[PDB]
Amino acid sequence: TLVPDLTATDLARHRWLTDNSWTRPTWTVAELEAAKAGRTISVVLPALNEEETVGGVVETIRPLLGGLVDELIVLDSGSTDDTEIRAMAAGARVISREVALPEVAPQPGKGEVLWRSLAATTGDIIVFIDSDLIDPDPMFVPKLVGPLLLSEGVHLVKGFYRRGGRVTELVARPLLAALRPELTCVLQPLGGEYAGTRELLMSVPFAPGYGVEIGLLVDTYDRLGLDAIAQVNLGVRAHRNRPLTDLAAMSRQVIATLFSRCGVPDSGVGLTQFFGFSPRTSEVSLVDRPPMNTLRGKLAAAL
Amino acid sequence: TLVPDLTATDLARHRWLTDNSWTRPTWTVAELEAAKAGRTISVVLPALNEEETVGGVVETIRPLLGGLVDELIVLDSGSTDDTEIRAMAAGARVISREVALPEVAPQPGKGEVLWRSLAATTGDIIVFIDSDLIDPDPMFVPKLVGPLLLSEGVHLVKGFYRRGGRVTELVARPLLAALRPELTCVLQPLGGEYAGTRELLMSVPFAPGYGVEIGLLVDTYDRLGLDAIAQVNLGVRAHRNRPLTDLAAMSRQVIATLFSRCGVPDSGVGLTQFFGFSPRTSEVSLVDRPPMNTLRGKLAAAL
Ligand SMILES: Nc1ccc(C(=O)O)cc1
Ligand SMILES: Nc1ccc(C(=O)O)cc1
Ligand SMILES: [Cl-]
Ligand SMILES: [Cl-]
Ligand SMILES: [Cl-]
Ligand SMILES: [Cl-]
Ligand SMILES: [Cl-]
Numbered sequence: 165t166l167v168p169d170l171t172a173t174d175l176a177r178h179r180w181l182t183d184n185s186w187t188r189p190t191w192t193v194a195e196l197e198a199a200k201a202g203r204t205i206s207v208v209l210p211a212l213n214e215e216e217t218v219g220g221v222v223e224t225i226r227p228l229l230g231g232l233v234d235e236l237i238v239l240d241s242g243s244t245d246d247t248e249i250r251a252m253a254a255g256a257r258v259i260s261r262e263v264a265l266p267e268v269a270p271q272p273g274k275g276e277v278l279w280r281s282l283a284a285t286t287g288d289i290i291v292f293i294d295s296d297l298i299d300p301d302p303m304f305v306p307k308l309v310g311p312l313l314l315s316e317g318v319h320l321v322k323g324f325y326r327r328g329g330r331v332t333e334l335v336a337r338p339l340l341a342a343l344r345p346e347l348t349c350v351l352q353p354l355g356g357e358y359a360g361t362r363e364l365l366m367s368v369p370f371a372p373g374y375g376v377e378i379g380l381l382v383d384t385y386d387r388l389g390l391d392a393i394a395q396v397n398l399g400v401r402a403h404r405n406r407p408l409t410d411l412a413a414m415s416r417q418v419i420a421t422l423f424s425r426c427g428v429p430d431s432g433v434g435l436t437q438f439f440g441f442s443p444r445t446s447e448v449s450l451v452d453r454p455p456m457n458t459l460r461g462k463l464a465a466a467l
Numbered sequence: 468t469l470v471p472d473l474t475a476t477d478l479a480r481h482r483w484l485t486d487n488s489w490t491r492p493t494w495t496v497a498e499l500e501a502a503k504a505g506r507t508i509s510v511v512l513p514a515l516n517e518e519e520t521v522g523g524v525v526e527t528i529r530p531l532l533g534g535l536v537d538e539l540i541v542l543d544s545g546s547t548d549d550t551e552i553r554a555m556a557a558g559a560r561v562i563s564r565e566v567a568l569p570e571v572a573p574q575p576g577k578g579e580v581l582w583r584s585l586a587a588t589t590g591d592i593i594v595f596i597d598s599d600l601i602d603p604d605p606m607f608v609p610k611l612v613g614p615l616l617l618s619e620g621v622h623l624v625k626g627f628y629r630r631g632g633r634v635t636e637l638v639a640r641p642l643l644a645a646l647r648p649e650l651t652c653v654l655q656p657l658g659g660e661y662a663g664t665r666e667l668l669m670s671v672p673f674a675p676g677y678g679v680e681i682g683l684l685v686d687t688y689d690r691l692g693l694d695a696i697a698q699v700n701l702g703v704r705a706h707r708n709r710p711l712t713d714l715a716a717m718s719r720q721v722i723a724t725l726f727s728r729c730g731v732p733d734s735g736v737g738l739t740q741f742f743g744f745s746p747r748t749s750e751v752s753l754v755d756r757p758p759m760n761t762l763r764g765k766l767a768a769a770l
């Protein structure tokens with residue numbers, strides 16, 4: 165809604181950018197592990213057909229398994245390439261969507277995968293890391309759990325890179341300025357590298373498809389306020405030059421998910437693209453998976 | 468609002484793409500001039516500091532002056548370079564914002580310029596052409612007025628190019644799919660080359676800044692329906708590689724203007740961009756210029 169008391173100038177000077185934003189995190193693995201205090205950490209990599217990169221991501225994380233990290237899972241989304249065997253060969257446990265939650269038939273898209281991984285994991289903290297990363301850094305998981313383990317009151321940590329992204333810069337952040345202005349303090353709201361506490365994640369809906377990350381950001385903000393969110397610098401990463409046609413369909417789902425969270429009536433109509441004319445249509449989903457907490461008791465595996 | 472009866476598939480197969488969309492316009496200047504039937508045509512080029520390109524755009528249009536075109540005006544927006552003298556030297560009349568409407572102090576931005584040009588022009592049809600075009604084609608004005616002069620019931624003509632644009636493809640068209648799905652049939656809703664009848668243009672508000680084009684599209688659609696809009700192929704044009712930082716600020720104003728037209732409460736908060744951090748803020752306007760018709764009677768020059 166209309167917030168004429170807030171300006172872009174005092175968003176740039178917002179105290180949150182100091183106390184909840186780590187440009188140069190200096191935490192050690194040993195001192196993070198010391199702060200677990202009986203909490204466990206689950207790392208989840210969503211994956212659909214990522215055979216060329218999934219092993220390299222898993223290998224950056226595997227040395228933490230059994231110390232800082234308690235579970236390392238690739239949640240496979242129906243890959244037909246060698247994603248699964250390569251993740252296993254790299255030292256990760258691989259769980260299909262069906263095995264994560266066999267009572268419920270899979271919907272397509274990324275959010276489904278992350279939602280199901282709540283039923284497959286046991287960590288008090290869950291870290292999500294994209295499996296398509298071309299050059300992952302082994303300090304990702306430590307930097308993401310830093311504010312959860314050491315700060316107070318943080319429940320969602322968003323990892324950003326110094327160069328980000330055409331959808332992030334033209335779609336997500338300008339819409340947040342219009343609909344959730346305080347969230348413009350988040351550098352990369354769509355980023356795939358982030359960590360959350362279990363109670364938070366079990367009690368929010370998961371948006372479908374590519375809306376999942378911005379949906380968690382906005383639901384966490386709405387539920388707990390800006391102080392409960394933090395961001396940390398993961399380092400440098402090259403913008404993978406994705407086709408604008410793919411980015412357009414993803415943008416449409418980002419819009420749908422944000423409108424869904426902000427009371428904006430979305431038409432539900434998918435995006436048409438023209439290239440006479442050669443038309444290309446995509447679909448968009450307006451239906452969340454409900455909070456996983458609502459399924460407690462009905463599951464053959466406890467939550 | 469929610470339109471679950473419409474899908475992206477039947478938008479791609481929409482009859483409008485045949486009867487109101489000209490992929491290969493074949494009109495001659497002589498036969499268009501024959502159809503004027505006493506209507507006059509005003510061509511308007513908005514311009515702020517366009518000394519390198521404005522003359523070349525004017526020269527592509529000047530041979531039509533006195534035949535198909537009755538007025539050729541560059542509406543200068545406070546240029547400090549040689550925009551004005553170069554437009555004059557190319558054969559255009561140059562009118563400042565103040566001379567267009569001296570009773571009202573200028574607001575910044577492009578929409579202000581186009582709104583003021585309604586008071587400075589006399590054509591029954593007004594054609595807007597950007598002055599920063601690097602390679603304008605002399606058939607722009609004929610192709611834009613074709614459907615106005617020959618078809619029935621068209622009041623707004625949008626000229627598109629075969630390659631368009633990151634803001635168009637990731638922001639404008641996906642938001643239209645969410646908020647005004649039928650308008651996704653328009654290939655380039657933000658395009659600067661378009662023509663409109665005077666009665667229509669005098670009776671709609673003009674959005675400020677870079678929102679002006681999408682605001683006219685949505686107001687025309689809301690007021691008169693999709694049949695009153697048409698689009699024509701102008702040919703090929705190179706995407707001028709504008710900085711993503713500029714595109715982000717323009718996207719924010721596009722969003723504000725669309726939310727303004729579609730009942731979506733916009734925060735009014737400008738876009739912050741970060742590059743410690745180096746913050747960069749822009750402003751956004753939620754205030755239209757009212758329909759120029761509302762100022763009739765109060766102007767020292769008649770409308
Ligand atoms: N079904 C899908 C599962 C995962 C992903 C992804 O990780 O980007 C995308 C689609
Ligand atoms: N004040 C302005 C006037 C004109 C333009 C433009 O034509 O892009 C931009 C700004
Ligand atoms: Cl502001
Ligand atoms: Cl800091
Ligand atoms: Cl089901
Ligand atoms: Cl992006
Ligand atoms: Cl919580």
Ligand SMILES: [Cl-]
Binds near residue numbers: 434446475476
């Ligand atoms: Cl659809």
Ligand SMILES: [Cl-]
Binds near residue numbers: 484485486488489
């Ligand atoms: Cl046609």
Ligand SMILES: [Cl-]
Binds near residue numbers: 571572
């Ligand atoms: Cl004034």
Ligand SMILES: [Cl-]
Binds near residue numbers: 632634
């Ligand atoms: Cl564009």
Ligand SMILES: [Cl-]
Binds near residue numbers: 622666
């Ligand atoms: Cl009208």
